[PDB]
Design a protein around this nucleic acid. Structure first.
Lengths: 267, 385, 125, 173, 125, 137
RNA sequence: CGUGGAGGUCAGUGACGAAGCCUAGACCGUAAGGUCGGGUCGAACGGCCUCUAGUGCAGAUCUUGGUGGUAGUAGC
RNA sequence: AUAUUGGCGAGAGACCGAUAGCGAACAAGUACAGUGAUGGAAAGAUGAAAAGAACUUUGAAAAGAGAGUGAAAAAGUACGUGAAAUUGUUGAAAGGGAAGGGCAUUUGAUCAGACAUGGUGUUUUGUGCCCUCUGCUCCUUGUGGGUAGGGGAAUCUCGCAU
């Protein structure tokens, strides 16, 4: 009977909540009397967060990644028949990225042809965006000289300040995994590697489980030994895809729906 | 079991000594007894091909156009013995990038097209080995009584050369191919100072769209001569090859130049490579060089790995027998090999060394190495107490 | 094909009388049977009732702005029927077709040169 | 008789008839030349029929006669057209000697349409596409949105940035 | 197609009987197939499953897991297998219910009654 | 920005919905500490809650000049519930580590609940006020 | 024109999402209505020839159910 | 041989499908009202599996904030989906004793806006279903269909590829 089930459990919940409240109040009183009991309880009780329940060289940097020996040269382009949103995103990308020369797709220059021309033109990395709807849906980076290509899926995008003329400071976090550290190194190399201390500009790439957040802020150190910050620029996420070793050859990761079934083991 | 792992990121040989069931991914599972790198030379001179001459010696062919002879010694560090590797002699200057660079145009991608070794196996006790390169330069290296490698002679081939498989089913003929290069049978003189082409493959008729079928053989495996009477002039040889366009071309010189039956392994011409020969019952039915010891294609079971993440098993008719490591492999399988006819070595960009049971298709070992794997050889399969 | 200019004779839906004023009244048209109803007498300043006058021309009937007649398509076999009428009919994919079948249908339509009225349905590039 | 069959298929639920919104009846029969269920167009209601079909790239001239009406197994006598527009049209005209102008004209039109549809090789020969149409299920979308929100909430981006800044500029420049 | 007039092909009747079936009938209902290795030995495809029997999971998220049956939950039309448990967030272990039809028997707990049933069912021992 | 925001919700509370809406509107957009002080003063009749929509038969008081409306009321139960919810929100923010002095009620909402009484659900969100940072020449 | 069910039919659609619902979206028909674009949803439903009726709502001081102004008012 | 709206036990429906169908799909001739003959309802569905929210914390009591299982909590034991009337917050617009609709135009906001891209005849090269020699096989036999082995382009635009 629906009425019987609803009524019986309604009373049970009230009694259980009242008992829990009384027990918690008595425990708080006893802890106030004896603070050590709180420490003893905490030493055995854990919030069991998702992060807490994780389920478990030199030539590489100089070969497959850019360095400060020579200034990077990055080629920026959009997909064929790109809409205004692609150009709007490229406007932000050129400002964020260093030495970006925007180019228009010519509808027939093959990826091999593009790579050959870039070798002729001496271009370090090629960044090509993806656009199905009137919003940016994908972002790709490739290190042209024998380097790999990283395909990123852009999900969120929205646009309280104006960036200054000083180069932002690059900071990375949560890249312990070998797959993660590769993406972190790629982001560090693609972004400028000569930040200006003056201007107090910070650019951060943060990832918690698997999504990497691109955020920019302006920070000032306060007298309380704590630093505040304010929103500065856009905010969007990215998700690596297929981690191809070559220009478009062997795929390394190929994140497919097979993953995310375990609900853990984030890469 | 004892295995040697070739690392490209570190350019060193890593030895794996672990028993069946080892899994470094999970702590609760058994862990490898010992693992360490040996003969580190960097990414520039990573090992390309490997071969175990004996239990105490081996020969390597690095990507720097150098073939080295490595001495193997065993000593104690349970209470197991680790392996120490030392170099006795080597031969360098075996690569020619000029021939391949001119072919960069008209290729598919990666204009660099860096030269690299494609095969390293004895010609046969003989102390002679064959070192082929993608540039079409075939070099014969012999281990003389002085114990120093010497290049007996050098031979040229129509570059690019994706593979070079020798013939050993007696019951000096080898087949080589490459991008837009038809399979050709070449005979080497006993003196090894010259070669002779005797047979070439012919492309199949056009496809539905009246377009020439792309030709790009990647690997080959010889079989025993076809039975029955043989026609005058035509040679008696059978070999099956795997093309990059997912075409299981089967060739029979007795029948004719054209393949007698071509079957599409996968739709949309999915990339394929790393051909192998195995048996469903896990038996050593393959010769020392891997050639199938049979005179019929109906008993041919092969393992081919696609470029993205998968490893495929196919029969003689192209039917798929099932994937290998579908739930464990998360990257391209750069190199695979069947050891002793039952063990299946696996590796690739996933940076994991896997041993699979051919009969049950069950994973046995999983060891993390960090660097990408391009060649795996199992010195022995003896367990350690 | 320079087809005749499309004339509709009307672009506003024939909303039912008092539909906006009263929520319970649906917008679907329904002739007023009231003897004293002003609408039934088509008084000045009132909505215009539908009638034969607004009939669309035969040549321009069932013609989309692009100039191609709409035709529902459920699979590749149905799409094949428009091989000889590509310039006069435009394939329309049903809302229930999944992405797996939709991509195949779109590929065949592009191969045959048949325009798709509603592309990019459940498919992301 | 054809007339009886023609009436039985016009009305009385012919199997292959599509009622388009425009009112035109489309015939899905593979052997039909126009694809429309009309007179002298439906192979079932016509003892004599001619159409152009193709399994592989080769184009054939399928024709039907009352002779094989008693033997449905081999009703059609397909003949290869020796693919070439001018000579193929000449061969079609020669084969359809004394045939109705309607049949000849529509067979030629069908052959021309099929031949020009062979240009699909142009798209396949010059595609080099980097998009490869991908479909996303709503369930996958939900797991890519709520989980993203949870990750953003638990990340504490501002706190992490503050901690990193308080560490970089506390032991060096 | 049924031929006997004493059997009713009614969905409602079958559903009512299945849910209201007694424990004795549910024992016959809770039958699982035998592994082909055991089939060649005893010459029987399926036998009733009891607590002492050992079974292997071949379907569901727990595929490839085998263990002894801790209990037979006839009321819930499911059985529990040793080492197949769901770890609650509080640290407690709860066996996962499994239908016998989705499990393959690897070993059988022999008894006088079990042997008699095997012989009656045409098997050999 | 959920990082710099905290929320507290109250549902199935046997309180007058009309008075709850008025007090929520009065306390809407006010600083956390200032809102708490104003509510505490209201408890002692020092200040009166301005009634705008549901203000039928309400006397004129000088305290209404502050809000611009003469009509005002002193709902003890509704203000008590509002201050309890605000205290819960402040405790949640303190647990989150947010700066209490910078908290302000950015959004407070009240709506009816399942039924002669007219219970209502009350939910409010407290967010830290944005602070500007100077640029560099 | 539309719906409940039935015979036939599309070797139909569909967990890579059927029905329903929402939609400051468009398309088709003079209209009854149909199609598709986007969000929730989860497991049945539809293209067409016929048969069938407990088959189409703006009211009947209509029935069952839900919610407002009066009103935080009269009143206790 | 005939009747049968009760009883026991069975087989079926072009029947209804939680405001329908017996009043009763569920604690239904139950709650409940009547001094009594009698009258007489409302109420189905979580999730596959409770795995029913471990643990921290604000809380006279009820609810929340973290945290967590589950594909989904946009499934919370008020649970398969969540329509209209109605109420609250936010954004936009208008308003002197109310409004709504139609013909007709200006404005903010907003939406759609090729995964179009070749065609013709020529000028080289490489192939094939194309040239040449020898073949195999299906019907029935025709103005046919299918399919191999050996040679080539300097005859080759019969198609395809650059």
């Amino acid at each position: 009977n629906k009425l019987k089930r609803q009524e019986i459990f309604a009373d049970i919940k009230h009694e259980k909540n009242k008992e829990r409240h009384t027990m918690r109040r008595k425990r708080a009183k006893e802890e106030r009397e004896n603070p050590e009991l709180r420490e003893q309880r905490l030493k055995e009780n854990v919030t069991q967060t998702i992060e807490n329940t994780r389920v478990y060289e030199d030539d590489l940097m100089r070969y497959f990644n850019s360095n400060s020996n020579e200034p990077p040269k990055i080629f920026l382009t959009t997909n064929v028949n790109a809409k205004k949103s692609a150009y709007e995103f490229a406007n932000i990308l050129i400002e964020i990225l260093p030495n970006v020369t925007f180019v228009k797709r010519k509808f027939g220059y093959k990826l091999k042809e593009i790579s050959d021309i870039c070798i002729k033109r001496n271009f370090t990395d090629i960044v090509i965006i993806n656009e199905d709807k009137k919003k940016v849906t994908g972002l790709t980076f490739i290190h042209l000289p024998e380097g790999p290509t990283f395909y990123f899926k852009l999900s969120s995008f929205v646009e309280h300040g104006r960036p200054t003329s000083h180069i932002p400071e690059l900071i990375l976090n949560n890249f312990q995994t070998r797959l993660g550290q590769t993406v972190g190194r790629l982001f560090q190399s693609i972004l400028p590697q000569n930040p200006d201390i003056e201007g107090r500009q910070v650019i951060t790439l943060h990832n918690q489980r698997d999504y990497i957040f691109f955020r920019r802020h302006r920070y000032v150190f306060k007298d309380n030994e704590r630093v505040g910050l304010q929103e500065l620029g856009p905010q969007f996420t990215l998700k690596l895809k297929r981690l191809q070793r070559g220009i478009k050859e062997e795929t390394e990761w190929e994140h497919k729906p097979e993953m995310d079934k375990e609900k853990k083991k984030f890469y | 079991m004892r295995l040697l792992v070739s690392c490209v990121d570190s350019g060193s040989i890593k030895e794996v000594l672990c028993n069946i069931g080892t899994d470094t991914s999970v702590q609760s599972a058994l862990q490898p007894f010992h693992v360490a790198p040996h003969l580190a030379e960097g990414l520039k001179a990573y090992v390309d091909r490997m071969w175990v001459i004996s239990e105490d010696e081996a020969i390597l062919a690095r990507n720097s156009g150098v073939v080295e002879l490595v001495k193997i010694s065993k000593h104690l560090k349970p209470k197991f013995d680790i392996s120490e590797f030392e170099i006795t002699s080597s031969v360098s200057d075996l690569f020619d990038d000029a021939k391949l660079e001119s072919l960069s145009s008209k290729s598919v991608k990666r204009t660099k097209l860096v030269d690299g070794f494609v095969t390293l196996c004895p010609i046969k006790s003989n102390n002679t080995f064959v070192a082929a390169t993608k540039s079409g330069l075939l070099h014969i290296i012999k281990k003389g009584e002085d114990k120093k490698l010497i290049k007996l002679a050098s031979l040229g081939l129509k570059a690019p050369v994706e593979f070079l498989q020798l013939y050993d089913l007696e019951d000096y003929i080898f087949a080589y191919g490459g991008e837009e290069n038809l399979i050709k049978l070449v005979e080497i003189d006993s003196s090894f100072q010259s070669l002779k082409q005797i047979w070439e493959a012919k492309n199949v008729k056009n496809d539905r769209l009246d377009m020439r079928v792309p030709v790009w053989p990647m690997a080959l495996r010889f079989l025993e001569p076809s039975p029955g009477k043989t026609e005058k002039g035509k040679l008696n040889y059978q070999f099956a090859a795997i093309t990059r366009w997912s075409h299981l071309t089967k060739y029979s010189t007795q029948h004719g130049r054209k393949p007698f039956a071509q079957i599409d392994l996968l739709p949309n011409r999915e990339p394929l490579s790393q051909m192998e020969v195995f048996d469903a019952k896990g038996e050593n039915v393959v010769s020392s060089l891997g050639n199938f010891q049979s005179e019929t294609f109906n008993e041919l079971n092969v393992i081919t790995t696609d470029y993205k993440k998968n490893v495929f098993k196919f029969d003689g008719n192209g039917r798929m027998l099932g994937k290998v490591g579908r739930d464990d492999i998360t990257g391209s399988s750069t190199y695979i090999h069947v050891h002793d006819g039952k063990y299946l070595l696996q590796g690739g960009l996933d940076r994991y060394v896997r041993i699979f049971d051919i009969k049950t298709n069950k994973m046995l070992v999983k060891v993390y190495v960090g660097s990408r794997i391009n060649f795996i050889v199992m010195l022995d399969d003896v367990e350690i107490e | 094909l320079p087809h005749p200019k499309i004339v509709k004779k009307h672009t506003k839906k024939f909303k039912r009388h008092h539909s906006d004023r009263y929520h319970r009244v649906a917008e679907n048209w329904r002739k007023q049977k009231g003897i004293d109803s002003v609408v039934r007498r088509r008084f000045r300043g009132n909505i215009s009732q539908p009638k034969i006058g607004y009939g669309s021309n035969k040549k321009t009937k069932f013609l989309s702005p692009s100039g191609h007649k709409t035709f529902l398509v459920a699979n590749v076999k149905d799409l094949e029927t428009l091989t000889m009428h590509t310039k006069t009919y435009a394939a329309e994919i049903a809302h229930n077709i999944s992405a797996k079948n939709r991509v195949v249908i779109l590929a065949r339509a592009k191969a045959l040169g048949i325009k798709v009225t509603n592309p990019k349905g459940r498919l992301a590039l | 008789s054809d007339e009886i069959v023609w009436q039985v298929i016009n009305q009385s639920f012919c199997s292959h008839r599509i009622k388009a919104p425009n009112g035109q009846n489309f015939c899905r029969n593979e052997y039909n030349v126009t694809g429309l269920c009309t007179r002298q167009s439906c192979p079932l209601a016509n003892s004599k029929y001619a159409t152009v079909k193709c399994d592989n790239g080769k184009l054939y001239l399928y024709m039907k006669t009352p002779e094989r009406a008693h033997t449905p197994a081999k009703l059609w006598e397909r003949i290869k057209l020796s693919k070439n527009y001018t000579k193929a049209l000449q061969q079609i005209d020669e084969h359809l000697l004394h045939w109705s102008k309607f049949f000849r004209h529509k067979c030629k039109q069908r052959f021309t349409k099929l031949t020009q549809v062979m240009i699909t090789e142009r798209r396949l020969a010059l595609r080099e596409e980097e998009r490869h149409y991908v479909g996303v299920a709503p369930k996958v979308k939900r797991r890519e949105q709520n989980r993203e929100r949870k990750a953003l909430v638990a990340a504490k981006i501002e706190k992490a940035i503050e901690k990193e800044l308080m560490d970089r500029l506390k032991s060096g420049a | 197609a049924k031929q006997s007039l004493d059997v009713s092909s009614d969905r409602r009747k079958a559903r009512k009987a299945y849910f209201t079936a007694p424990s004795s009938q549910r024992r016959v209902l809770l039958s699982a197939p035998l592994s082909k290795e055991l089939r060649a030995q005893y010459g029987i495809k399926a036998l009733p499953i009891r607590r002492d029997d050992e079974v292997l999971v071949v379907r569901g998220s727990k595929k490839g897991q085998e263990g002894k049956i801790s209990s037979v939950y006839r009321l819930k039309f499911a059985v529990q297998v040793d080492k197949v448990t769901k770890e609650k967030v509080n640290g407690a272990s709860v066996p996962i219910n499994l239908h016998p039809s989705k499990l393959v028997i690897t070993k059988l707990h022999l008894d006088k009654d079990r042997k008699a049933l095997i012989q009656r069912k045409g098997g050999k021992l | 920005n959920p990082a710099k925001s905290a929320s507290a919700r109250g549902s199935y509370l046997r309180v007058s919905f009309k008075n709850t809406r008025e007090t929520a509107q009065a306390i809407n957009g006010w600083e956390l500490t200032k809102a708490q002080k104003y509510l505490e003063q209201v408890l002692d009749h020092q200040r009166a809650i301005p009634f705008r929509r549901f203000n039928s038969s309400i006397g004129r008081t000088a305290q209404g000049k502050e809000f611009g409306v003469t009509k005002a009321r002193w709902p003890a139960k509704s203000v008590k519930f509002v201050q309890g919810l605000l205290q819960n929100a402040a405790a949640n923010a303190e647990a989150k580590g947010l700066d209490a002095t910078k908290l302000y009620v950015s959004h407070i909402q009240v709506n009816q609940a399942p039924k002669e009484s007219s219970p209502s659900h009350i939910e409010l969100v407290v967010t830290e006020k944005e602070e500007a940072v100077a640029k560099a020449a």
